[PDB]
Amino acid sequence: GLEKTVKEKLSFEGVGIHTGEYSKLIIHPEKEGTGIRFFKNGVYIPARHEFVVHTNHSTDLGFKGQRIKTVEHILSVLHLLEITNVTIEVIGNEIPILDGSGWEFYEAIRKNILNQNREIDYFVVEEPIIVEDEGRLIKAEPSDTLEVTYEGEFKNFLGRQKFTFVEGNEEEIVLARTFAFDWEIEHIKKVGLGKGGSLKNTLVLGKDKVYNPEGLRYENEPVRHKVFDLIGDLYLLGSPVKGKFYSFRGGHSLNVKLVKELAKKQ
Ligand SMILES: CCCCCCCCCCCCCCCC(=O)O
Ligand SMILES: CCCCCCCCCCCCCC(=O)O
Ligand SMILES: [Cl-]
Ligand SMILES: [Zn+2]
Ligand SMILES: [Zn+2]
Numbered sequence: 001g002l003e004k005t006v007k008e009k010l011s012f013e014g015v016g017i018h019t020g021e022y023s024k025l026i027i028h029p030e031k032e033g034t035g036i037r038f039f040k041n042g043v044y045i046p047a048r049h050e051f052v053v054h055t056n057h058s059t060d061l062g063f064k065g066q067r068i069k070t071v072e073h074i075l076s077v078l079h080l081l082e083i084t085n086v087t088i089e090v091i092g093n094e095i096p097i098l099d100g101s102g103w104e105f106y107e108a109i110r111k112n113i114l115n116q117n118r119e120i121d122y123f124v125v126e127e128p129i130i131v132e133d134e135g136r137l138i139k140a141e142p143s144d145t146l147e148v149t150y151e152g153e154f155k156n157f158l159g160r161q162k163f164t165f166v167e168g169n170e171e172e173i174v175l176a177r178t179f180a181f182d183w184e185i186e187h188i189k190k191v192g193l194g195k196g197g198s199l200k201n202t203l204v205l206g207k208d209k210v211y212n213p214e215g216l217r218y219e220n221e222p223v224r225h226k227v228f229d230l231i232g233d234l235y236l237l238g239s240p241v242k243g244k245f246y247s248f249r250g251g252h253s254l255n256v257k258l259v260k261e262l263a264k265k266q
Contacts (some may be wrong), residue, residue: 016094020195023092076232100177125243176224
């Protein structure tokens with residue numbers, strides 16, 4: 001595939017799920033070889049693993065005193081559409097959560113793609129690798145196409161379920177929303193996070209119920225979202241990725257761990 005950017009600048013605004021503050025981003029086109037980078041208060045923050053500063057409840061990046069929380073959804077959409085050269089100006093300290101999925105990002109960007117004059121140099125997983133953390137595990141192996149499987153084991157009605165993404169099925173995960181278990185909301189609030197969360201941007205699940213009146217978009221929306229999250233974190237490798245991944249109860253922390261190990265080996 002050819003490197004790509006946007007035909008014209010695109011903007012999105014709303015509240016940050018964690019800061020609860022107003023935030024906006026403006027995606028500006030860039031020439032070939034530029035890569036993906038954020039811009040905040042005068043500083044450019046490359047969308048790469050070296051700049052990750054936090055991974056609990058979101059993937060946050062930072063450089064020279066400037067931080068941007070929750071980049072996983074916008075990066076996932078960019079990765080899925082193979083947008084390789086753009087500057088994402090950010091107003092605020094976090095990417096707007098919108099409806100909790102990548103839908104708005106996806107539909108807007110997909111309609112404004114601009115192919116460029118340069119072949120994409122994909123990050124190709126060369127050899128099998130596995131990272132673990134108290135039961136949680138992620139395995140990556142060679143593959144000509146990006147394939148991502150997530151298997152969860154939930155302590156509620158969801159039980160054990162899995163979902164596999166394969167190239168071409170982007171629409172099957174870009175609508176999956178951010179979720180959250182009622183028994184964990186106090187903690188999230190207590191650690192200074194989740195200030196902008198609401199039934200409008202997050203699926204709240206109980207031991208045996210779904211609080212949102214709209215219910216789940218798919219019986220397995222949570223695992224679909226996890227796949228969506230992992231795909232965004234994988235883009236932190238600096239280039240579109242080709243490989244087969246299997247995540248069992250993985251989260252941002254483990255996702256970034258895998259990314260750093262892959263980058264290290266290669
Ligand atoms: C670990 C990942 C997730 C990010 C989740 C942040 C969102 C915080 C939750 C806010 C929802 C509050 C809803 C009130 C509780 C209720 O109705 O039972
Ligand atoms: C179903 C749409 C209704 C809006 C969703 C209701 C959830 C909002 C409650 C959290 C907002 C309060 C933030 C705070 O804790 O100060
Ligand atoms: Cl925490
Ligand atoms: Zn926590
Ligand atoms: Zn997410």
